[PDB]
Paper text:
Here we report that three evolutionarily-distinct [name] isoenzymes (BioH1 to [name]) are programmed in biotin synthesis of Mycobacterium smegmatis. The BioC-aided methylation enables the resultant malonyl-ACP (CoA) methyl ester to undergo two reiterations of FAS II cycles, generating methyl pimeloyl-ACP thioester that is subsequently hydrolyzed by the promiscuous [name] [name] to give pimeloyl-ACP (pim-ACP or C7-ACP), a precursor for biotin synthesis. The enzymatic activity in vitro combined with biotin bioassay in vivo reveals that BioH2 and [name] are capable of removing methyl moiety from pimeloyl-ACP methyl ester to give pimeloyl-ACP, a cognate precursor for biotin synthesis. As a member of the α/β-hydrolase (i.e., [name]) family, they adopt an identical pattern of domain organization, i.e., N-terminal lid domain connected with a core domain at C-terminus.
The crystals of [name] were grown using the sitting-drop vapor diffusion method and diffracted up to 2.27-Å resolution. The crystal belongs to the P21 space group, and contains six protein molecules per asymmetric unit (ASU). The two [name] monomers contact each other via two interfaces (Interface I & Interface II), giving a 2-fold axis-centering dimeric architecture. The fact that total buried surface area of the two interfaces is over 1760 Å2 underlined the stable existence of [name] dimer. First, its core domain is of α/β-fold in nature, comprising of six parallel β-strands (β1–4 and β7–8), five α-helices (α1–3 and α10–11) and a short α9 turn. In contrast to its core domain, the lid domain of [name] is pretty unique. Apart from α-helices, the lid domain of [name] also contains two β-strands (β5–6) and several connecting linkers. However, crystal structure of [name] illustrated that only two predicted residues (S103 and H265) are localized in the catalytic triad. Instead of D248 predicted by sequence alignment, the residue D232 participates in the formation of catalytic triad. Similar to the Shigella [name] with known complex structure, the PEG-loading cavity of [name] are mainly formed by the side chains of hydrophobic residues (e.g., W18, F137, and F183) from its core domain.
Numbering used by the authors:
A (entry chain A): 6 to 282
B (entry chain B): 8 to 282
């Protein structure tokens, strides 16, 4: 693991900060790691003009500043990060979580030489269906906790969530979807560490990958069996459908118990898993 | 085989190092960022912090009231102990109030640090409390932070970047992010934490010249700092060097504001990689 680097790509509404504890776990095994902040996430992220204002005026109608972000912009940010570290490490592992699988996969398609192994952590695999919504709305995913995404995401230019809502039922839906295994008396800092706007392209734009570029990279899926945001059945569906398109290079399959956020609630064993890939 | 362990400052978290971490990887320097107790995803919020009008924010006792300076330092030691056998060279980089816990951690376990970097950070060698330097005459020129009154009774030094008073919010911006472009996004406002543990700025940090004082160390002064005066940074350097005449500070510099890992992450990473 002396020359292995894990490039971590966060999921929708999250950022690089959610990987922090898992990065500590990886270092404990001598695995260096960096976390990419996709456009619209991290310290650079915007918020709607009323998101931090009492009453939250205009939140349901204001157009998002992320409306013009394309799927290629998200992938090219991953390509840029992979390109900056390629000459420094012999083995580069691309680790994507949830919606990050789109941009990570397209980056591996654009530049397969920059990626030595793909790791999908309950993430979107665009091999068989190019849009994440193609799986989110599939019958296998009907039993997940329905996220309170704002109506008409195409017009806002983003899939909008409101963890700062005064509606405790609304906030509790986000809580149960992402952080199901959270202790009953846990701190509430996570509420203002999420970003409200996820670019429309992230969940709704097609991600075209081919079996002769993306499909030849060694890859592993990590299924989260207690996932209430993306059903384990949907995760198995993505593994089976993608494998049928690359029969000579099938998915490696690992498994963890618990909710959609093992980097938060199981960072130690997630790092141990990643170091074993 | 070099690992940089990054300790954030007050009201911040590991998140703010992200751009500098990517810059360090460019140069082949691995890095992790520690989240001190009460920061990051572990951070609590007052019950009214996210409520319209923020009721009770001025009086509610903090959940961080019982965190001691030893708790903050022991978290740094625990992080340093996990990576010691995996890297030949461990750089402990502290920013601002992070210098307190990082220095006490280095004093508790000197074999876990090969070099200390103080990035406009508190150096407790000559004065054990950060307020000994914050309230020094050399620091009178900083942008006054709108910290809530009576931090001892609250159990925290409280900041309110979510305040409806634009002047209050702008004072936080002018102190930490003076060089912010004119039309920058607002995300930074909700990525700060309101409560900094009372011990962070007020508790004494005891280090000795034969433990902490023997570790190679560097200070990175920020010349356009409006949160911690550059004069205060030079004073900390000089006063600390008198107590360790055999091991004086290495002194480097960066222009710009108090947040170089936000506004100058490239040159900051070039500096750290060259240490």
């Amino acid at each position: 693991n002396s020359g292995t680097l894990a490039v971590l790509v966060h999921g929708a509404w999250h950022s690089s900060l959610h990987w922090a504890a898992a990065q500590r776990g990886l270092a404990r095994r001598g695995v260096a790691s960096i976390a990419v902040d996709l456009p619209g996430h991290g310290l650079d992220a915007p918020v709607p003009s009323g998101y931090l204002t009492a009453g939250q005026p205009g939140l349901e109608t204001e157009k998002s500043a992320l409306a013009d972000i394309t799927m290629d912009d998200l992938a090219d940010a991953v390509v840029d990060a992979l390109a900056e570290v390629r000459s420094r490490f012999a083995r580069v592992l691309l680790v994507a979580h949830s919606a990050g699988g789109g941009p990570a996969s397209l980056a591996a398609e654009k530049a397969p030489e920059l990626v030595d192994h793909l790791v999908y952590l309950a993430a979107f695999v665009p091999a068989a269906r190019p849009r994440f919504t193609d799986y989110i709305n599939a019958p296998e995913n009907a039993d997940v906790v329905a996220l309170p995404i704002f109506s008409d995401p195409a017009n806002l230019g983003a899939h909008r969530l409101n963890p700062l809502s005064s509606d405790a039922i609304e906030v509790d839906a986000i809580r149960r979807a992402f952080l199901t295994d959270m202790p009953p008396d846990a701190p509430e800092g996570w509420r203002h560490l999420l970003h409200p706007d996820e670019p429309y392209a992230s969940l709704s734009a097609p991600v075209p990958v081919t079996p002769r570029r993306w499909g030849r990279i060694p890859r592993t899926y990590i299924r989260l069996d207690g996932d209430r945001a993306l059903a384990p059945t949907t995760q198995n569906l993505m593994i089976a459908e993608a494998d049928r398109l690359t029969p000579d290079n099938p998915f490696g399959v690992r498994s963890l118990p618990g909710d959609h956020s093992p980097m938060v609630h199981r960072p130690g064993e997630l790092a141990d898993l990643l170091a074993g890939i």
